[PDB]
């Protein structure tokens, strides 16, 4: 399962 | 910005047996960026209903895709894979070398 959405670069 | 030209392998899923159904594979790898044009050729002509794997990439960030279609080899029909990419001046054709 995917990781939670991360912060923008 | 660095670009990488595709490696190309043309081969069949199973060992070639004239008259028996099989799959024809064109595997392109090591290229960057990911835009690529791949056609499968029967005696010289584009084949319809060719599918391809989803886009992934290798440890070194270069992309790879597998293009395939079902087919039935004869001694007559000659097959090839035609690849175009930004690194390539003209489309590159690799023939299926059976043995």
């Amino acid at each position: 399962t995917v990781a939670a959405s991360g912060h923008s670069y | 910005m660095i670009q990488r030209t595709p490696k190309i392998q043309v081969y069949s899923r199973h060992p070639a047996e004239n008259g028996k159904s099989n799959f024809l594979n064109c595997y392109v790898s090591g290229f960057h960026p990911s835009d690529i044009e791949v056609d499968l050729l029967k005696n010289g002509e584009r084949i319809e209903k060719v599918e391809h794997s989803d886009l992934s990439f290798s440890k070194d960030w270069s992309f790879y895709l597998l293009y395939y279609t079902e087919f039935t080899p004869t001694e007559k029909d000659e097959y090839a894979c035609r690849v175009n990419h930004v690194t390539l001046s003209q489309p590159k054709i690799v023939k299926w070398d059976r043995d």
Partner: protein
């Protein structure tokens, strides 16, 4: 024995041809099991292996929602990175990301990964301690400071030690008849004369899974590393892989050459000679 789960993200701008495309694919070892493509008619996380289909609606909704959010964030990040490098709006650029976990045979976490590349070059990577970052240049340092303030490393560490390992355990159990079945290579040796005095010996391996394999030629028990042509391991299309190793031998010296094959699906490692 050991196993891995990896997700691979690619975000690709295409100026003048719509918004950047975001593609996600998930693998367990060498088996793809999910995909998401933001160009799809109805964008969603979709199954690519049978053993994942049984997952419930909350699974596909969570995975699709995260992926939809990622589509927009990666669009933001491409704009940001274009600025970090003073690049113009005309060119197309690519963010790639890989992350996931390796587990040993007990299912315990061996290590986690998260790393990113911009236009094919290493950009930022989470260090093995799952706590600090390696930035490749002063552009990546900005991303690093953003991610420290966002506590990215702590979230990824929690994921890599929690969900990643747990769901990998669960995937390995549900797909155990394929993911934990090692298919041995079918092998044979071929002989292609080149001239009156030399010929090519080619050692073939077909139908094996996983892709990891060792194919080597020996001359009088000595490895022919420099002189062996190895093709890249290629997929057959039916989950299995193929590979060959080839060596050019003086005609009449064939039986001094042995092909050696190690693969997890083999009872014993193999030694093969050309059989005329």
């Amino acid at each position: 024995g050991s196993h891995s789960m990896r997700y691979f993200y690619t975000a690709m701008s295409r100026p003048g041809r719509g918004e950047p495309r975001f593609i996600a694919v998930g693998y367990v070892d060498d088996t793809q099991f999910v995909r998401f493509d933001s160009d799809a008619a109805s964008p969603r996380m979709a199954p690519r292996a049978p053993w994942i289909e049984q997952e419930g609606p909350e699974y596909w909704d969570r995975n699709t929602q995260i992926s939809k959010t990622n589509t927009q964030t990666y669009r933001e990040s491409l704009r940001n990175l274009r600025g970090y490098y003073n690049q113009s709006e005309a060119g197309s650029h690519i963010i790639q990301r890989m992350y996931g976990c390796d587990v040993g045979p007990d299912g315990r976490l061996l290590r986690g990964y998260d790393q990113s590349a911009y236009d094919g070059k290493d950009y930022i990577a989470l260090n093995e301690d799952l706590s600090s970052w390696t930035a490749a240049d002063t552009a990546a340092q900005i991303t690093q400071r953003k991610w420290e303030a966002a506590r990215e490393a702590e979230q990824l560490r929690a994921y890599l030690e929690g969900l990643c390992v747990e769901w990998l355990r669960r995937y390995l159990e549900n797909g155990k008849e394929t993911l934990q079945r090692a298919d041995p290579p079918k092998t044979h040796v071929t002989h292609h004369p080149i001239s009156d005095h030399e010929a090519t010996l080619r050692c073939w391996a077909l139908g094996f899974y996983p892709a990891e394999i060792t194919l080597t030629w020996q001359r009088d028990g000595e490895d022919q590393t420099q002189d062996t042509e190895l093709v890249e391991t290629r997929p057959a299309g039916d989950r299995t892989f193929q590979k060959w190793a080839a060596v050019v031998v003086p005609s009449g010296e064939e039986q001094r050459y042995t092909c050696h094959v190690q693969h997890e699906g083999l009872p014993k490692p193999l030694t093969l000679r050309w059989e005329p």
